[PDB]
Amino acid sequence: KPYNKIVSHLLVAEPEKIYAMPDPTVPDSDIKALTTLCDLADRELVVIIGWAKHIPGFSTLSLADQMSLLQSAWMEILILGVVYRSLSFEDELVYADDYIMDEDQSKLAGLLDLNNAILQLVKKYKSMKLEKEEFVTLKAIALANSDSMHIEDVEAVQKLQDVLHEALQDYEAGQHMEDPRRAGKMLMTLPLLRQTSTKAVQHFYNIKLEGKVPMHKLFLEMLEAKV
Amino acid sequence: KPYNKIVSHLLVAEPEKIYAMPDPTVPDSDIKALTTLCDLADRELVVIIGWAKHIPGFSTLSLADQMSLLQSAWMEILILGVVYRSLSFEDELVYADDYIMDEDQSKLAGLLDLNNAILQLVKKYKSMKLEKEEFVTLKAIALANSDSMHIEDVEAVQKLQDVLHEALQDYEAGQHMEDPRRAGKMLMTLPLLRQTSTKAVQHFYNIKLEGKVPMHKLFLEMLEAKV
Numbered sequence: 001k002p003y004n005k006i007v008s009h010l011l012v013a014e015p016e017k018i019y020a021m022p023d024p025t026v027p028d029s030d031i032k033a034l035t036t037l038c039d040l041a042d043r044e045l046v047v048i049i050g051w052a053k054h055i056p057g058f059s060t061l062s063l064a065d066q067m068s069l070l071q072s073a074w075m076e077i078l079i080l081g082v083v084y085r086s087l088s089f090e091d092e093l094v095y096a097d098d099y100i101m102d103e104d105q106s107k108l109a110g111l112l113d114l115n116n117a118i119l120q121l122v123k124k125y126k127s128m129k130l131e132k133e134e135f136v137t138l139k140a141i142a143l144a145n146s147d148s149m150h151i152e153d154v155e156a157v158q159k160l161q162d163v164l165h166e167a168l169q170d171y172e173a174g175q176h177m178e179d180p181r182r183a184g185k186m187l188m189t190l191p192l193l194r195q196t197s198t199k200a201v202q203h204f205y206n207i208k209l210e211g212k213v214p215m216h217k218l219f220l221e222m223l224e225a226k227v
Numbered sequence: 228k229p230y231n232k233i234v235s236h237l238l239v240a241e242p243e244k245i246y247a248m249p250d251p252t253v254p255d256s257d258i259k260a261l262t263t264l265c266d267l268a269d270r271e272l273v274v275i276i277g278w279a280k281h282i283p284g285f286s287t288l289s290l291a292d293q294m295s296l297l298q299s300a301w302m303e304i305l306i307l308g309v310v311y312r313s314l315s316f317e318d319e320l321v322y323a324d325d326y327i328m329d330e331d332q333s334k335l336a337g338l339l340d341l342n343n344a345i346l347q348l349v350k351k352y353k354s355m356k357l358e359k360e361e362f363v364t365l366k367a368i369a370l371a372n373s374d375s376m377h378i379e380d381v382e383a384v385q386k387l388q389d390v391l392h393e394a395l396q397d398y399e400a401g402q403h404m405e406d407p408r409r410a411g412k413m414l415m416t417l418p419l420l421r422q423t424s425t426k427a428v429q430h431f432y433n434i435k436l437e438g439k440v441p442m443h444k445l446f447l448e449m450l451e452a453k454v
């Protein structure tokens with residue numbers, strides 16, 4: 001009854017906010033916004049890798065299977081983060097406290113369609129009143145459910161999926177008794193997340209080939225894995 | 228205890244098998260396979276539209292909202308069908324009884340990567356022993372959960388989602404007592420379905436622009452809606 005330990009644990013393992021710090025010496029331009037965003041992503045992925053080791057069972061997989069999960073799920077983790085930070089805002093995406101993209105900046109950056117898809121994720125979660133407890137559980141599920149076609153131990157990854165789905169089911173059964181289907185509702189938000197992340201990955205891989213926007217090693221490695 | 232009526236109803240509303248009938252006068256080629264497949268799709272979409280009217284609540288939405296759901300979900304419905312027909316096969320996709328694609332034909336048709344993604348859907352469902360009862364419920368859910376960004380009555384579509392998610396939850400709670408999380412497991416197969424269908428839509432829209440493969444009105448209309 002007090003509530004689910006995995007959800008508690010995920011809460012306290014939630015990394016601290018990080019700043020985008022767009023270079024205040026560089027004139028605004030699409031290249032500046034895209035450099036800034038992929039710079040921020042590269043920093044967030046460091047923190048994401050650290051965070052994953054908090055997920056029960058995760059650090060017990062092979063390094064290869066750890067990497068495979070992260071290489072598949074990184075973009076959905078990143079997007080769920082900007083979605084969650086944006087729930088109190090209206091038509092704006094809080095990439096960071098100092099980097100809030102409105103429609104006008106989305107257009108300038110060539111990101112109007114993707115950001116509009118991400119806004120559709122925010123809109124659904126706003127209506128569902130997504131809680132931080134659910135947000136963290138969904139990030140972890142998104143990692144374990146990431147559909148890497150490279151898993152060595154398929155059964156241990158399906159066990160990690162089970163563990164986390166259970167934590168979601170138990171959280172919802174204790175906290176959200178008014179809706180016996182709230183857990184399933186949350187799971188059904190995942191296909192739009194996968195959809196958007198698939199398009200974001202394509203967008204950014206294209207940006208990388210085109211080579212106008214500098215990217216860092218970690219973000220490039222993730223970008224370069226199965227796409 | 229006998230079991231869930233919506234699942235029963237979906238079962239009996241399941242359309243009959245249809246044949247691909249590749250033209251036995253046309254020499255085999257990528258254009259022939261792709262013509263045949265988009266021809267079959269066009270015929271299946273007629274039957275899919277008919278079928279949807281069986282789903283409780285569906286025919287009560289606006290024609291616009293009916294069309295919007297179908298325009299978003301058509302490809303995931305089609306793919307789930309070929310996946311389901313392929314579960315008893317090994318590395319082969321049963322587009323129709325007379326049209327079973329192996330790896331060699333996938334390569335010839337430029338479909339090796341997509342068909343390999345579809346095979347990954349089959350592999351997961353084989354391990355899960357997907358039943359016809361689940362397959363039909365998942366098709367219906369995929370329709371209601373299709374994330375059209377054009378819905379007029381958002382609340383009635385979320386009610387259709389609720390109804391069908393409930394039918395899945397009840398089916399699993401009665402039939403699959405050995406796994407209290409089987410319903411959620413099924414829902415978590417949906418992101419790979421959305422992933423694959425997003426890539427299939429892009430693939431085929433490209434095929435259409437390129438104009439080497441003739442397509443019929445219905446398939447073209449669905450192809451032309453938000454992409």
Ligand SMILES: CC(C)(c1ccc(O)cc1)c1ccc(O)c(F)c1
Nearest residue numbers: 037038041078079082111114115200
């Ligand atoms: C991957 C990236 C660069 C990003 C996403 C989240 C985040 O917290 C940092 C960067 C990103 C993805 C899709 C977008 O429309 C976007 F603006 C930025």
Ligand SMILES: CC(C)(c1ccc(O)cc1)c1ccc(O)c(F)c1
Nearest residue numbers: 264265268305306309338341342427
């Ligand atoms: C949309 C289409 C043409 C199709 C899918 C299912 C079906 O039953 C008929 C056609 C299709 C999609 C993805 C593929 O890799 C494919 F081979 C065919």
